[PDB]
PDB file of all heavy atoms in Angstrom:
ATOM      1  N   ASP A   1      57.850  76.521  82.047  1.00 48.88           N
ATOM      2  CA  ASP A   1      56.898  77.015  81.105  1.00 48.88           C
ATOM      3  C   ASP A   1      56.308  75.792  80.375  1.00 48.88           C
ATOM      4  O   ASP A   1      56.967  75.126  79.593  1.00 48.88           O
ATOM      5  CB  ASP A   1      57.564  77.969  80.135  1.00 48.88           C
ATOM      6  CG  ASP A   1      56.486  78.696  79.298  1.00 48.88           C
ATOM      7  OD1 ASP A   1      55.749  77.982  78.631  1.00 48.88           O
ATOM      8  OD2 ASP A   1      56.535  79.949  79.359  1.00 48.88           O
ATOM      9  N   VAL A   2      55.029  75.560  80.670  1.00 48.51           N
ATOM     10  CA  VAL A   2      54.366  74.354  80.210  1.00 48.51           C
ATOM     11  C   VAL A   2      54.059  74.365  78.726  1.00 48.51           C
ATOM     12  O   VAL A   2      54.119  73.333  78.091  1.00 48.51           O
ATOM     13  CB  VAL A   2      53.115  74.054  81.083  1.00 48.51           C
ATOM     14  CG1 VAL A   2      53.574  73.753  82.509  1.00 48.51           C
ATOM     15  CG2 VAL A   2      52.069  75.127  81.007  1.00 48.51           C
ATOM     16  N   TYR A   3      53.811  75.556  78.145  1.00 47.36           N
ATOM     17  CA  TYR A   3      53.625  75.641  76.704  1.00 47.36           C
ATOM     18  C   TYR A   3      54.900  75.361  75.985  1.00 47.36           C
ATOM     19  O   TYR A   3      54.944  74.556  75.016  1.00 47.36           O
ATOM     20  CB  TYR A   3      53.099  77.027  76.352  1.00 47.36           C
ATOM     21  CG  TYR A   3      53.046  77.271  74.821  1.00 47.36           C
ATOM     22  CD1 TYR A   3      52.015  76.728  74.062  1.00 47.36           C
ATOM     23  CD2 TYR A   3      53.988  78.035  74.190  1.00 47.36           C
ATOM     24  CE1 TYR A   3      51.944  77.014  72.687  1.00 47.36           C
ATOM     25  CE2 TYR A   3      53.950  78.301  72.831  1.00 47.36           C
ATOM     26  CZ  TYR A   3      52.920  77.782  72.090  1.00 47.36           C
ATOM     27  OH  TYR A   3      52.778  78.036  70.772  1.00 47.36           O
ATOM     28  N   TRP A   4      56.031  75.986  76.401  1.00 47.19           N
ATOM     29  CA  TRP A   4      57.273  75.786  75.672  1.00 47.19           C
ATOM     30  C   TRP A   4      57.757  74.323  75.860  1.00 47.19           C
ATOM     31  O   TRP A   4      58.398  73.796  74.966  1.00 47.19           O
ATOM     32  CB  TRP A   4      58.355  76.792  76.080  1.00 47.19           C
ATOM     33  CG  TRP A   4      58.044  78.207  75.700  1.00 47.19           C
ATOM     34  CD1 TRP A   4      57.988  79.245  76.513  1.00 47.19           C
ATOM     35  CD2 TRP A   4      57.799  78.694  74.366  1.00 47.19           C
ATOM     36  NE1 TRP A   4      57.670  80.382  75.843  1.00 47.19           N
ATOM     37  CE2 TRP A   4      57.579  80.092  74.511  1.00 47.19           C
ATOM     38  CE3 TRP A   4      57.754  78.150  73.109  1.00 47.19           C
ATOM     39  CZ2 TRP A   4      57.313  80.895  73.438  1.00 47.19           C
ATOM     40  CZ3 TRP A   4      57.509  78.978  71.995  1.00 47.19           C
ATOM     41  CH2 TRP A   4      57.357  80.302  72.174  1.00 47.19           C
ATOM     42  N   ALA A   5      57.465  73.738  77.029  1.00 49.84           N
ATOM     43  CA  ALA A   5      57.743  72.309  77.187  1.00 49.84           C
ATOM     44  C   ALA A   5      57.044  71.468  76.138  1.00 49.84           C
ATOM     45  O   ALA A   5      57.664  70.607  75.504  1.00 49.84           O
ATOM     46  CB  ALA A   5      57.398  71.843  78.599  1.00 49.84           C
ATOM     47  N   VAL A   6      55.721  71.702  75.947  1.00 53.64           N
ATOM     48  CA  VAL A   6      54.962  70.947  74.942  1.00 53.64           C
ATOM     49  C   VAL A   6      55.538  71.191  73.553  1.00 53.64           C
ATOM     50  O   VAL A   6      55.736  70.264  72.737  1.00 53.64           O
ATOM     51  CB  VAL A   6      53.481  71.267  75.072  1.00 53.64           C
ATOM     52  CG1 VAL A   6      52.711  70.687  73.954  1.00 53.64           C
ATOM     53  CG2 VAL A   6      52.972  70.804  76.418  1.00 53.64           C
ATOM     54  N   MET A   7      55.922  72.440  73.270  1.00 53.89           N
ATOM     55  CA  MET A   7      56.492  72.788  71.978  1.00 53.89           C
ATOM     56  C   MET A   7      57.856  72.112  71.762  1.00 53.89           C
ATOM     57  O   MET A   7      58.246  71.836  70.610  1.00 53.89           O
ATOM     58  CB  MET A   7      56.679  74.297  71.900  1.00 53.89           C
ATOM     59  CG  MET A   7      55.356  75.005  71.703  1.00 53.89           C
ATOM     60  SD  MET A   7      54.599  74.857  70.057  1.00 53.89           S
ATOM     61  CE  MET A   7      55.632  76.046  69.164  1.00 53.89           C
ATOM     62  N   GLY A   8      58.520  71.745  72.854  1.00 54.90           N
ATOM     63  CA  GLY A   8      59.741  70.979  72.883  1.00 54.90           C
ATOM     64  C   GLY A   8      59.531  69.461  72.884  1.00 54.90           C
ATOM     65  O   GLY A   8      60.475  68.700  73.037  1.00 54.90           O
ATOM     66  N   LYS A   9      58.282  69.046  72.732  1.00 54.44           N
ATOM     67  CA  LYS A   9      57.884  67.620  72.700  1.00 54.44           C
ATOM     68  C   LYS A   9      58.034  66.959  74.052  1.00 54.44           C
ATOM     69  O   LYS A   9      58.067  65.734  74.147  1.00 54.44           O
ATOM     70  CB  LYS A   9      58.631  66.830  71.619  1.00 54.44           C
ATOM     71  CG  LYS A   9      58.436  67.383  70.217  1.00 54.44           C
ATOM     72  CD  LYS A   9      59.106  66.538  69.134  1.00 54.44           C
ATOM     73  CE  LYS A   9      58.810  66.928  67.724  1.00 54.44           C
ATOM     74  NZ  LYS A   9      59.294  68.288  67.466  1.00 54.44           N
ATOM     75  N   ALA A  10      58.095  67.784  75.117  1.00 52.89           N
ATOM     76  CA  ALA A  10      58.232  67.271  76.474  1.00 52.89           C
ATOM     77  C   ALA A  10      56.889  67.161  77.143  1.00 52.89           C
ATOM     78  O   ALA A  10      55.977  67.968  76.916  1.00 52.89           O
ATOM     79  CB  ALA A  10      59.197  68.133  77.263  1.00 52.89           C
ATOM     80  N   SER A  11      56.726  66.183  78.068  1.00 55.72           N
ATOM     81  CA  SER A  11      55.566  66.075  78.887  1.00 55.72           C
ATOM     82  C   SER A  11      55.838  66.731  80.207  1.00 55.72           C
ATOM     83  O   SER A  11      56.707  66.273  80.937  1.00 55.72           O
ATOM     84  CB  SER A  11      55.323  64.580  79.158  1.00 55.72           C
ATOM     85  OG  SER A  11      54.531  64.418  80.318  1.00 55.72           O
ATOM     86  N   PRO A  12      55.077  67.770  80.611  1.00 56.37           N
ATOM     87  CA  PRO A  12      55.312  68.401  81.901  1.00 56.37           C
ATOM     88  C   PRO A  12      55.219  67.343  83.034  1.00 56.37           C
ATOM     89  O   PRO A  12      56.001  67.390  83.982  1.00 56.37           O
ATOM     90  CB  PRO A  12      54.242  69.517  81.971  1.00 56.37           C
ATOM     91  CG  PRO A  12      53.996  69.811  80.499  1.00 56.37           C
ATOM     92  CD  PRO A  12      54.182  68.523  79.714  1.00 56.37           C
ATOM     93  N   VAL A  13      54.202  66.501  82.970  1.00 58.11           N
ATOM     94  CA  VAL A  13      53.969  65.574  84.055  1.00 58.11           C
ATOM     95  C   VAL A  13      55.143  64.577  84.177  1.00 58.11           C
ATOM     96  O   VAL A  13      55.569  64.288  85.306  1.00 58.11           O
ATOM     97  CB  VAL A  13      52.616  64.864  83.919  1.00 58.11           C
ATOM     98  CG1 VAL A  13      52.436  63.804  84.981  1.00 58.11           C
ATOM     99  CG2 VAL A  13      51.477  65.863  84.040  1.00 58.11           C
ATOM    100  N   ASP A  14      55.647  64.082  83.050  1.00 55.91           N
ATOM    101  CA  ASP A  14      56.800  63.182  83.120  1.00 55.91           C
ATOM    102  C   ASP A  14      58.057  63.869  83.717  1.00 55.91           C
ATOM    103  O   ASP A  14      58.765  63.293  84.574  1.00 55.91           O
ATOM    104  CB  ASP A  14      57.083  62.560  81.796  1.00 55.91           C
ATOM    105  CG  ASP A  14      56.035  61.554  81.302  1.00 55.91           C
ATOM    106  OD1 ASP A  14      55.154  61.207  82.112  1.00 55.91           O
ATOM    107  OD2 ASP A  14      56.051  61.264  80.080  1.00 55.91           O
ATOM    108  N   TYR A  15      58.265  65.166  83.408  1.00 52.72           N
ATOM    109  CA  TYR A  15      59.261  65.991  84.062  1.00 52.72           C
ATOM    110  C   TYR A  15      58.991  66.048  85.579  1.00 52.72           C
ATOM    111  O   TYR A  15      59.964  65.945  86.332  1.00 52.72           O
ATOM    112  CB  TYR A  15      59.484  67.354  83.376  1.00 52.72           C
ATOM    113  CG  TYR A  15      60.555  67.243  82.333  1.00 52.72           C
ATOM    114  CD1 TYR A  15      60.271  66.809  81.035  1.00 52.72           C
ATOM    115  CD2 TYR A  15      61.852  67.572  82.616  1.00 52.72           C
ATOM    116  CE1 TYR A  15      61.271  66.690  80.120  1.00 52.72           C
ATOM    117  CE2 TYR A  15      62.882  67.440  81.674  1.00 52.72           C
ATOM    118  CZ  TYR A  15      62.601  67.016  80.407  1.00 52.72           C
ATOM    119  OH  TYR A  15      63.601  66.891  79.477  1.00 52.72           O
ATOM    120  N   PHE A  16      57.753  66.357  85.998  1.00 52.98           N
ATOM    121  CA  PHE A  16      57.448  66.449  87.415  1.00 52.98           C
ATOM    122  C   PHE A  16      57.845  65.185  88.191  1.00 52.98           C
ATOM    123  O   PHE A  16      58.385  65.233  89.303  1.00 52.98           O
ATOM    124  CB  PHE A  16      55.983  66.668  87.601  1.00 52.98           C
ATOM    125  CG  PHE A  16      55.414  68.038  87.129  1.00 52.98           C
ATOM    126  CD1 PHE A  16      54.045  68.182  87.027  1.00 52.98           C
ATOM    127  CD2 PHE A  16      56.221  69.108  86.837  1.00 52.98           C
ATOM    128  CE1 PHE A  16      53.474  69.420  86.685  1.00 52.98           C
ATOM    129  CE2 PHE A  16      55.663  70.327  86.488  1.00 52.98           C
ATOM    130  CZ  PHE A  16      54.351  70.492  86.382  1.00 52.98           C
ATOM    131  N   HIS A  17      57.601  64.015  87.532  1.00 54.45           N
ATOM    132  CA  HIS A  17      57.872  62.749  88.195  1.00 54.45           C
ATOM    133  C   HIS A  17      59.347  62.435  88.204  1.00 54.45           C
ATOM    134  O   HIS A  17      59.801  61.695  89.092  1.00 54.45           O
ATOM    135  CB  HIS A  17      56.985  61.647  87.605  1.00 54.45           C
ATOM    136  CG  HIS A  17      55.587  61.773  88.142  1.00 54.45           C
ATOM    137  ND1 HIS A  17      55.148  61.225  89.317  1.00 54.45           N
ATOM    138  CD2 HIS A  17      54.550  62.413  87.656  1.00 54.45           C
ATOM    139  CE1 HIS A  17      53.874  61.562  89.515  1.00 54.45           C
ATOM    140  NE2 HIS A  17      53.478  62.279  88.514  1.00 54.45           N
ATOM    141  N   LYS A  18      60.104  62.900  87.190  1.00 53.15           N
ATOM    142  CA  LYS A  18      61.498  62.602  87.106  1.00 53.15           C
ATOM    143  C   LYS A  18      62.278  63.472  88.087  1.00 53.15           C
ATOM    144  O   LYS A  18      63.345  63.019  88.583  1.00 53.15           O
ATOM    145  CB  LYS A  18      61.940  62.930  85.701  1.00 53.15           C
ATOM    146  CG  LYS A  18      63.259  62.445  85.276  1.00 53.15           C
ATOM    147  CD  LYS A  18      63.540  62.505  83.745  1.00 53.15           C
ATOM    148  CE  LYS A  18      64.637  61.554  83.423  1.00 53.15           C
ATOM    149  NZ  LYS A  18      65.495  62.034  82.320  1.00 53.15           N
ATOM    150  N   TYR A  19      61.780  64.709  88.437  1.00 53.16           N
ATOM    151  CA  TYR A  19      62.535  65.647  89.232  1.00 53.16           C
ATOM    152  C   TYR A  19      61.593  66.224  90.291  1.00 53.16           C
ATOM    153  O   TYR A  19      61.290  67.408  90.322  1.00 53.16           O
ATOM    154  CB  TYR A  19      63.225  66.761  88.406  1.00 53.16           C
ATOM    155  CG  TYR A  19      64.099  66.308  87.276  1.00 53.16           C
ATOM    156  CD1 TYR A  19      63.637  66.283  85.955  1.00 53.16           C
ATOM    157  CD2 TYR A  19      65.325  65.748  87.554  1.00 53.16           C
ATOM    158  CE1 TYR A  19      64.485  65.832  84.924  1.00 53.16           C
ATOM    159  CE2 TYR A  19      66.128  65.237  86.556  1.00 53.16           C
ATOM    160  CZ  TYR A  19      65.701  65.270  85.234  1.00 53.16           C
ATOM    161  OH  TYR A  19      66.506  64.761  84.250  1.00 53.16           O
ATOM    162  N   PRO A  20      61.044  65.393  91.183  1.00 54.26           N
ATOM    163  CA  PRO A  20      60.026  65.829  92.150  1.00 54.26           C
ATOM    164  C   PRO A  20      60.615  66.974  92.963  1.00 54.26           C
ATOM    165  O   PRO A  20      61.800  66.969  93.355  1.00 54.26           O
ATOM    166  CB  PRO A  20      59.666  64.637  93.026  1.00 54.26           C
ATOM    167  CG  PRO A  20      60.707  63.625  92.648  1.00 54.26           C
ATOM    168  CD  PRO A  20      61.333  63.937  91.320  1.00 54.26           C
ATOM    169  N   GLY A  21      59.720  67.980  93.202  1.00 57.61           N
ATOM    170  CA  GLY A  21      60.024  69.096  94.054  1.00 57.61           C
ATOM    171  C   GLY A  21      60.787  70.252  93.389  1.00 57.61           C
ATOM    172  O   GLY A  21      60.947  71.274  94.032  1.00 57.61           O
ATOM    173  N   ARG A  22      61.341  70.093  92.175  1.00 57.14           N
ATOM    174  CA  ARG A  22      62.215  71.056  91.564  1.00 57.14           C
ATOM    175  C   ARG A  22      61.440  72.217  90.886  1.00 57.14           C
ATOM    176  O   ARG A  22      62.085  73.191  90.532  1.00 57.14           O
ATOM    177  CB  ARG A  22      63.231  70.459  90.569  1.00 57.14           C
ATOM    178  CG  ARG A  22      64.212  69.498  91.161  1.00 57.14           C
ATOM    179  CD  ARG A  22      65.134  70.137  92.176  1.00 57.14           C
ATOM    180  NE  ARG A  22      66.062  71.170  91.679  1.00 57.14           N
ATOM    181  CZ  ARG A  22      67.246  71.032  91.109  1.00 57.14           C
ATOM    182  NH1 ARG A  22      67.706  69.772  90.969  1.00 57.14           N
ATOM    183  NH2 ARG A  22      68.003  72.031  90.751  1.00 57.14           N
ATOM    184  N   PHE A  23      60.106  72.033  90.692  1.00 57.56           N
ATOM    185  CA  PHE A  23      59.348  72.968  89.888  1.00 57.56           C
ATOM    186  C   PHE A  23      58.514  73.858  90.822  1.00 57.56           C
ATOM    187  O   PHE A  23      57.306  73.701  90.965  1.00 57.56           O
ATOM    188  CB  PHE A  23      58.458  72.241  88.903  1.00 57.56           C
ATOM    189  CG  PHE A  23      59.298  71.336  88.011  1.00 57.56           C
ATOM    190  CD1 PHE A  23      59.439  69.997  88.388  1.00 57.56           C
ATOM    191  CD2 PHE A  23      60.010  71.764  86.917  1.00 57.56           C
ATOM    192  CE1 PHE A  23      60.245  69.173  87.596  1.00 57.56           C
ATOM    193  CE2 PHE A  23      60.775  70.934  86.149  1.00 57.56           C
ATOM    194  CZ  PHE A  23      60.895  69.606  86.522  1.00 57.56           C
ATOM    195  N   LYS A  24      59.155  74.807  91.446  1.00 55.93           N
ATOM    196  CA  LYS A  24      58.594  75.620  92.514  1.00 55.93           C
ATOM    197  C   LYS A  24      57.624  76.687  91.933  1.00 55.93           C
ATOM    198  O   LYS A  24      56.800  77.234  92.697  1.00 55.93           O
ATOM    199  CB  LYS A  24      59.601  76.223  93.479  1.00 55.93           C
ATOM    200  CG  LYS A  24      60.425  75.184  94.223  1.00 55.93           C
ATOM    201  CD  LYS A  24      61.421  75.847  95.165  1.00 55.93           C
ATOM    202  CE  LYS A  24      62.190  74.816  95.872  1.00 55.93           C
ATOM    203  NZ  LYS A  24      63.060  75.331  96.933  1.00 55.93           N
ATOM    204  N   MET A  25      57.770  77.061  90.669  1.00 54.84           N
ATOM    205  CA  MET A  25      56.766  77.884  90.053  1.00 54.84           C
ATOM    206  C   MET A  25      56.486  77.343  88.673  1.00 54.84           C
ATOM    207  O   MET A  25      57.330  76.644  88.089  1.00 54.84           O
ATOM    208  CB  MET A  25      57.219  79.348  89.993  1.00 54.84           C
ATOM    209  CG  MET A  25      57.223  79.973  91.413  1.00 54.84           C
ATOM    210  SD  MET A  25      57.182  81.786  91.386  1.00 54.84           S
ATOM    211  CE  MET A  25      58.802  81.840  90.692  1.00 54.84           C
ATOM    212  N   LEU A  26      55.266  77.588  88.203  1.00 54.36           N
ATOM    213  CA  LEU A  26      54.927  77.273  86.808  1.00 54.36           C
ATOM    214  C   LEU A  26      54.638  78.585  86.100  1.00 54.36           C
ATOM    215  O   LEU A  26      54.028  79.474  86.665  1.00 54.36           O
ATOM    216  CB  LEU A  26      53.731  76.374  86.684  1.00 54.36           C
ATOM    217  CG  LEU A  26      53.805  75.036  87.442  1.00 54.36           C
ATOM    218  CD1 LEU A  26      52.490  74.332  87.225  1.00 54.36           C
ATOM    219  CD2 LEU A  26      54.987  74.231  86.921  1.00 54.36           C
ATOM    220  N   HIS A  27      55.033  78.659  84.806  1.00 54.37           N
ATOM    221  CA  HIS A  27      54.518  79.665  83.913  1.00 54.37           C
ATOM    222  C   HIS A  27      53.385  78.952  83.199  1.00 54.37           C
ATOM    223  O   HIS A  27      53.612  77.995  82.422  1.00 54.37           O
ATOM    224  CB  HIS A  27      55.580  80.104  82.880  1.00 54.37           C
ATOM    225  CG  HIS A  27      56.112  81.468  83.140  1.00 54.37           C
ATOM    226  ND1 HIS A  27      56.567  82.266  82.133  1.00 54.37           N
ATOM    227  CD2 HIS A  27      56.306  82.040  84.364  1.00 54.37           C
ATOM    228  CE1 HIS A  27      56.972  83.389  82.793  1.00 54.37           C
ATOM    229  NE2 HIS A  27      56.837  83.250  84.101  1.00 54.37           N
ATOM    230  N   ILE A  28      52.202  79.458  83.464  1.00 55.83           N
ATOM    231  CA  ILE A  28      50.974  79.021  82.840  1.00 55.83           C
ATOM    232  C   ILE A  28      50.855  79.895  81.580  1.00 55.83           C
ATOM    233  O   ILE A  28      50.469  81.053  81.613  1.00 55.83           O
ATOM    234  CB  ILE A  28      49.820  79.212  83.826  1.00 55.83           C
ATOM    235  CG1 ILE A  28      50.064  78.364  85.113  1.00 55.83           C
ATOM    236  CG2 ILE A  28      48.498  78.867  83.162  1.00 55.83           C
ATOM    237  CD1 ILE A  28      50.206  76.882  84.909  1.00 55.83           C
ATOM    238  N   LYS A  29      51.209  79.217  80.475  1.00 54.28           N
ATOM    239  CA  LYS A  29      51.282  79.840  79.184  1.00 54.28           C
ATOM    240  C   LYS A  29      50.587  78.898  78.199  1.00 54.28           C
ATOM    241  O   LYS A  29      50.605  77.703  78.396  1.00 54.28           O
ATOM    242  CB  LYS A  29      52.717  80.104  78.755  1.00 54.28           C
ATOM    243  CG  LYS A  29      52.819  80.885  77.438  1.00 54.28           C
ATOM    244  CD  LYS A  29      54.233  81.189  76.956  1.00 54.28           C
ATOM    245  CE  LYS A  29      54.179  82.011  75.654  1.00 54.28           C
ATOM    246  NZ  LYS A  29      53.309  81.408  74.649  1.00 54.28           N
ATOM    247  N   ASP A  30      50.002  79.503  77.149  1.00 52.63           N
ATOM    248  CA  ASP A  30      49.414  78.761  76.025  1.00 52.63           C
ATOM    249  C   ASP A  30      49.811  79.508  74.759  1.00 52.63           C
ATOM    250  O   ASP A  30      50.697  80.339  74.739  1.00 52.63           O
ATOM    251  CB  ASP A  30      47.907  78.635  76.234  1.00 52.63           C
ATOM    252  CG  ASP A  30      47.191  77.444  75.542  1.00 52.63           C
ATOM    253  OD1 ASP A  30      47.767  76.977  74.593  1.00 52.63           O
ATOM    254  OD2 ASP A  30      46.087  77.075  75.996  1.00 52.63           O
ATOM    255  N   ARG A  31      49.261  79.127  73.578  1.00 52.52           N
ATOM    256  CA  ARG A  31      49.643  79.854  72.403  1.00 52.52           C
ATOM    257  C   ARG A  31      49.199  81.322  72.465  1.00 52.52           C
ATOM    258  O   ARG A  31      49.948  82.245  72.173  1.00 52.52           O
ATOM    259  CB  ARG A  31      49.022  79.094  71.196  1.00 52.52           C
ATOM    260  CG  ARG A  31      49.252  79.774  69.849  1.00 52.52           C
ATOM    261  CD  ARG A  31      49.401  78.829  68.657  1.00 52.52           C
ATOM    262  NE  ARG A  31      50.566  77.970  68.812  1.00 52.52           N
ATOM    263  CZ  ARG A  31      50.956  77.028  68.013  1.00 52.52           C
ATOM    264  NH1 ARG A  31      50.197  76.774  66.914  1.00 52.52           N
ATOM    265  NH2 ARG A  31      52.053  76.327  68.210  1.00 52.52           N
ATOM    266  N   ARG A  32      47.951  81.483  72.850  1.00 51.52           N
ATOM    267  CA  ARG A  32      47.263  82.797  73.126  1.00 51.52           C
ATOM    268  C   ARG A  32      46.634  82.774  74.506  1.00 51.52           C
ATOM    269  O   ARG A  32      47.394  82.506  75.490  1.00 51.52           O
ATOM    270  CB  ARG A  32      46.365  83.195  71.923  1.00 51.52           C
ATOM    271  CG  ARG A  32      47.140  83.429  70.655  1.00 51.52           C
ATOM    272  CD  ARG A  32      46.420  83.949  69.417  1.00 51.52           C
ATOM    273  NE  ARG A  32      45.184  83.196  69.165  1.00 51.52           N
ATOM    274  CZ  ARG A  32      45.069  82.058  68.471  1.00 51.52           C
ATOM    275  NH1 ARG A  32      46.163  81.515  67.932  1.00 51.52           N
ATOM    276  NH2 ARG A  32      43.865  81.552  68.269  1.00 51.52           N
ATOM    277  N   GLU A  33      45.297  82.921  74.640  1.00 50.77           N
ATOM    278  CA  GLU A  33      44.654  82.910  75.903  1.00 50.77           C
ATOM    279  C   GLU A  33      44.795  81.520  76.559  1.00 50.77           C
ATOM    280  O   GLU A  33      44.739  80.501  75.862  1.00 50.77           O
ATOM    281  CB  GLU A  33      43.194  83.281  75.865  1.00 50.77           C
ATOM    282  CG  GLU A  33      42.954  84.688  75.348  1.00 50.77           C
ATOM    283  CD  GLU A  33      43.210  84.944  73.907  1.00 50.77           C
ATOM    284  OE1 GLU A  33      43.054  84.042  73.037  1.00 50.77           O
ATOM    285  OE2 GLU A  33      43.763  86.052  73.593  1.00 50.77           O
ATOM    286  N   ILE A  34      44.990  81.488  77.861  1.00 49.20           N
ATOM    287  CA  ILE A  34      45.205  80.229  78.623  1.00 49.20           C
ATOM    288  C   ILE A  34      43.976  79.366  78.447  1.00 49.20           C
ATOM    289  O   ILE A  34      42.845  79.763  78.705  1.00 49.20           O
ATOM    290  CB  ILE A  34      45.460  80.543  80.089  1.00 49.20           C
ATOM    291  CG1 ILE A  34      46.730  81.408  80.308  1.00 49.20           C
ATOM    292  CG2 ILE A  34      45.549  79.227  80.903  1.00 49.20           C
ATOM    293  CD1 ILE A  34      47.971  80.953  79.538  1.00 49.20           C
ATOM    294  N   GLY A  35      44.279  78.124  77.944  1.00 46.27           N
ATOM    295  CA  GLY A  35      43.300  77.061  77.867  1.00 46.27           C
ATOM    296  C   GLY A  35      42.484  77.057  76.595  1.00 46.27           C
ATOM    297  O   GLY A  35      41.444  76.383  76.604  1.00 46.27           O
TER     298      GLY A  35
END
């Protein structure tokens, strides 16, 4: 969940690079409407 990751002070992209291939689905989430 990319919104909750940001709310956790995490970078999604830095996670993707640290653990390649492990993120087989994304929850595309925002505060309200996406984007």
Side-chain angles (χ1 to χ4, degrees):
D1 190 303
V2 296
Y3 172 80
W4 295 125
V6 171
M7 288 286 283
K9 302 183 172 63
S11 159
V13 174
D14 291 349
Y15 270 84
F16 291 167
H17 283 274
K18 194 167 200 214
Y19 306 100
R22 297 295 294 274
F23 305 93
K24 298 181 181 188
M25 289 199 293
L26 303 178
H27 253 207
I28 301 300
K29 185 179 182 308
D30 205 340
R31 178 147 296 179
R32 295 186 314 274
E33 297 71 30
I34 299 313

